[PDB]
Amino acid sequence: IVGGYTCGANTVPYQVSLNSGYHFCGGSLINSQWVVSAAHCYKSGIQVRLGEDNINVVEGNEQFISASKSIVHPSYNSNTLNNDIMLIKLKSAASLNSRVASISLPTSCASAGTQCLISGWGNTKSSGTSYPDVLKCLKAPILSDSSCKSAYPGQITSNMFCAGYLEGGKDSCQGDSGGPVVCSGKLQGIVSWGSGCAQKNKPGVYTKVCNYVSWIKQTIASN
Ligand SMILES: [Ca+2]
Ligand SMILES: [Ca+2]
Question: Is 195 an active-site residue?
Answer without folding.
Answer: no
